[PDB]
Each structure stands twice: as structure tokens, then as C-alpha cells.
Design a binder for this molecule. Structure first.
Ligand SMILES: [Zn+2]
Length: 323
């Protein structure tokens, strides 16, 4: 019985030196992400809506144009909702599908349903159009490096549908796509032909991005079994800062602070966490002041903060993957 699912417990990053850190800082472009990945997503896109379809096509199109060998799968299913049966579609983008282990980055691409109000439309800019655009920018920025993957370890991106409650949050009305996908992955043998390991055993770490884009976020270290990876993010932020590679940033106002959080935040990682998958939940505490209001829009986003976080996340991913 191979002990491969235990490898994630000992996996160590391959730390980039200064020269490589500057290369990564210069290789990502917040303005290109803004125009080409973010703005097309700033539309109403609740499950089943025409915007949901447009959002999904945009995400797939942006991934399909890259050189790395991404394999796209749309996981479509039915679920009961306060409005009756409905269809949802998770988007999964994977490099090396048969690779035994994957580092997984995720976010939700649906937007919370709200009837139009005084002509305002909810577009959930930080929740989670920006996280989505950040995953797309990361795939674009590291494309040349990711091409080299074409440690049996690779990368996967999941864009969940139906994270939001149709009404207010309840156990049965929220996390439609993640509850579905976690159960599906838990019952899918992996790698192909395996006797007793599933796709969940292959998830080295689930990095879930949510509510990102507002000024001064503070991300707490939620779980002891991913704490050493939260520390890597702190170290990366500190060195990019010291190298003068971040913008309008100070260590007193650093994003990754040394502090736990006992409570439970309901989000897409829950169904995975509860089946034993290690999770790094990149959600700030407190939430953006515009959370679930019509003001969660483009105008209230903090560009240099998103830019800094794109740099930190891209360095984290390269180091994790030894690229
Ligand atoms: Zn939300």
C-alpha cells in the first residue's frame, strides 16, 4: 500500500532567491488583469443566469489561450434550492490530470442573487470576481513556467458555482457546488485505476481565495494543519516587502498576521475540510465593509493591494511546485 498520500505532510517548498523574486514581481501586470480578466466578470452571474454562462465562457476562454496544457472540465449537476430544482456548473482546470498530487487554488464564480434595487445590480467584485481574476492572472503570468510540467505533483484550479445562499445562509441553502464536488472527488479513485485512494487524497492543499480586493485585509491563520504554509505566505510577503517589490505596503499593516481564529467561517472549503483535506483559507477577518451590498463594486477595489497579493500568491505557487 503506497504511502504516497502522506507525501504532502513532508513536502517542502523550493525557495526563490532575490533575483527570481524580482522576476516574478515584474512578470505580473495588474492593469492587464484588470482589463482582460476582471472587468468581463463584473456582471450579474447568479446560478442559472445568462451572466453565469458568460462568466464560465470567459473563464474557459482565458485558460484555453495559454500554452500550458490545461484540461478543462465542467462539473454540472442538479440540486434542490429554496426555488426548486436547479442546475449548477463547477469549472475545474487541471495540469497533469493523472498526476497523483495537486496543489489546488480555488474561488467561487457565482455572484449572490439580488433583485435589482433602484437600478443597482450586485456584481460581488471582491466576492469573488477579484479572486477569480487573480487565478486567471496567475495562470497567465506563470504560463511559461507551468508549461514545463507537461514529486508527482501539479496544479489545479477550481471555480465553484453556487457558493452563495439564494436567501440568507442556511446549511441546505449555500455551498452547492463545493458540497457536490467534495463528495464527487471523495468517491472518485485516483490516480486512474487506484484501488483505495481518491481525488481528495491527492489534494495536497486547498488554497481558497475569497473576499479579496478591499483595502487593508488581514488574513488570520485558521488551521493548525496548514499553519506552516500560512507561515510561508508571511515569509514571502516580508521578503517581497524588504526587496521593495510591493506597493503602498508596510509591515505594521501586513496582510498575513500571526493570529489564530477559533470560529468557523462558512465557505467552499467546509465540505473539503470535513473530509480531511488541508485548507489554507485566504479570507480576511473582518470582511470587506462592502460585503453583500451593492457597493461591492469596481470603484471600491484597492488596486495596489490586489497587485501585492498576486505577487505573493504567484511566488507561493512556484515555490510549492518547485518551479
Ligand atoms: Zn458572498
Amino acid at each position: 500500500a503506497s504511502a504516497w498520500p502522506e507525501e504532502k505532510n513532508y513536502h517542502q517548498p523550493a525557495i526563490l532567491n532575490s533575483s527570481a523574486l524580482r522576476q516574478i514581481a515584474e512578470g505580473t501586470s495588474i492593469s492587464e488583469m484588470w482589463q482582460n480578466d476582471l472587468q468581463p466578470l463584473l456582471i450579474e452571474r447568479y446560478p442559472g443566469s445568462p451572466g453565469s454562462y458568460a462568466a464560465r465562457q470567459h473563464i474557459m476562454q482565458r485558460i484555453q489561450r495559454l500554452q500550458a496544457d490545461w484540461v478543462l472540465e465542467i462539473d454540472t449537476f442538479l440540486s434542490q434550492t429554496p426555488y426548486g430544482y436547479r442546475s449548477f456548473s463547477n469549472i475545474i482546470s487541471t495540469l497533469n490530470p493523472t498526476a497523483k498530487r495537486h496543489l489546488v487554488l480555488a474561488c467561487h464564480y457565482d455572484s449572490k442573487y439580488f433583485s435589482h434595487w433602484n437600478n443597482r445590480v450586485f456584481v460581488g467584485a471582491t466576492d469573488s470576481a477579484v479572486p477569480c481574476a487573480m487565478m486567471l492572472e496567475l495562470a497567465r503570468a506563470l504560463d511559461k513556467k507551468l508549461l514545463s510540467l507537461k514529486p508527482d505533483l501539479s496544479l489545479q484550479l477550481i471555480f465553484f458555482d453556487g457558493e452563495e445562499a439564494f436567501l440568507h445562509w442556511s446549511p441546505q441553502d449555500s455551498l452547492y457546488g463545493s458540497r457536490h464536488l467534495a463528495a464527487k472527488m471523495a468517491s472518485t479513485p485516483h490516480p486512474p485505476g487506484a484501488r483505495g485512494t481518491s481525488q481528495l487524497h491527492g489534494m495536497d492543499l486547498l488554497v481558497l481565495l475569497a473576499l479579496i480586493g478591499a483595502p487593508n485585509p488581514t488574513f488570520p491563520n485558521f488551521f493548525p494543519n496548514s499553519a506552516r504554509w500560512f507561515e510561508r505566505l508571511q515569509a514571502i510577503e516580508h521578503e517581497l516587502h524588504e526587496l521593495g517589490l510591493l506597493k503602498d505596503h508596510s509591515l505594521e499593516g501586513r496582510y498575513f498576521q500571526n493570529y489564530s481564529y477559533g470560529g468557523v467561517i462558512q465557505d467552499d472549503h467546509i465540505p473539503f475540510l470535513r473530509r480531511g483535506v488541508p485548507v489554507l483559507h485566504l479570507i480576511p477577518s473582518p470582511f470587506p465593509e462592502v460585503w453583500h451590498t451593492m457597493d461591492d463594486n469596481e470603484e471600491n477595489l484597492d488596486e495596489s493591494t490586489i497587485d501585492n497579493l498576486n505577487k505573493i500568491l504567484q511566488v507561493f505557487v512556484l515555490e510549492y511546485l518547485h518551479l
